[PDB]
Design a protein around this ligand. Structure first.
Ligand code: MMA
Ligand code: MMA
Lengths: 110, 110
C-alpha cells in the first residue's frame, strides 16, 4: 500500500511503498524516513527522539508522530476543515497530504 | 500501487490494488470496476461502450473515462479549484478522490 487515510496510523516498523525503490517508513527509532533504493531522501529528522512511535493523519489534515508516551514529537501543523484526508507516497516520489473529500464511491468502509 | 494522482491516467488493463482482495481496474471493454475477491462491488457501468479506454484524474478534481476516440464516456463532474488531486482505493474498500494539496515533502517529482 502507498497511502494512509485519516484517521488511521502507520505503526512502528511499517511503511508505505511504491515499487521498486520507494519506501516511506515509520521507524522503530521514531524517525519518519523516505528511502530511495536504500538512500534517505527525506525525513522528519526525529530519530532517537523516542521509540514505539506511530504516524497519524487526522481527519482535519494534521499529520503527527506520537512517541510511546503518546506525546507529539513532530507535526505538519496543517489543521483545516474537519472531514477526511489521505497521505500518499507517489510514483513521482513526492509524499503528499490531500483533502478534503471531493468524491467517493461509497464502496467502503466494508 | 493503490492511488492515481492528477493529472495522470490509469490505462487499459491496468489497475489499483490493495492486497489481497481489492482490485480497481480500467478494463479493456471500457468498464471501470472494483472487484472484491473476484466479485464486482462497484463500477462506472460503462462496459461495452468503447475500447482502449483510460481513466484520468484532472488537476481540478474531475475524474473521467475516455474512449479510444478520446471522447468522454463517463465522469464524476467534480470540477473544483485548479491544483492537484489523488484517487485512492483504500484498505477499507472505499474509492475516494481527495484534494486539493494540504502539504507536501517536495521529495518529488524526481
Ligand atoms: C465516511 O468515511 C468514509 O468515507 C469517506 C469519503 O466519503 C472516506 O474519506 C473515509 O476514509 C471513509 O472511507
Ligand atoms: C507540483 O506538483 C507536484 O507536487 C504536488 C504537491 O505540491 C503534487 O500534488 C503533485 O502530484 C506533484 O508531485
Amino acid at each position: 500500500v502507498n497511502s494512509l487515510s485519516s484517521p488511521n496510523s502507520l505503526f512502528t516498523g511499517h511503511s508505505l511503498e511504491v515499487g521498486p525503490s520507494y519506501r516511506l517508513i515509520m521507524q522503530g527509532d521514531c524517525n519518519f524516513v523516505l528511502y530511495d533504493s536504500g538512500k534517505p531522501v527525506w525525513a522528519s529528522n526525529t530519530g532517537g527522539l523516542g521509540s514505539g512511535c506511530r504516524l497519524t493523519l487526522h481527519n482535519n489534515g494534521n499529520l503527527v508522530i506520537y512517541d510511546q508516551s503518546n506525546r507529539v514529537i513532530w507535526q505538519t501543523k496543517t489543521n483545516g476543515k474537519e472531514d477526511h484526508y489521505v497521505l500518499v507516497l507517489q510514483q513521482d516520489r513526492n509524499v503528499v497530504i490531500y483533502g478534503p473529500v471531493v468524491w467517493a464511491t461509497g464502496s467502503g468502509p466494508a
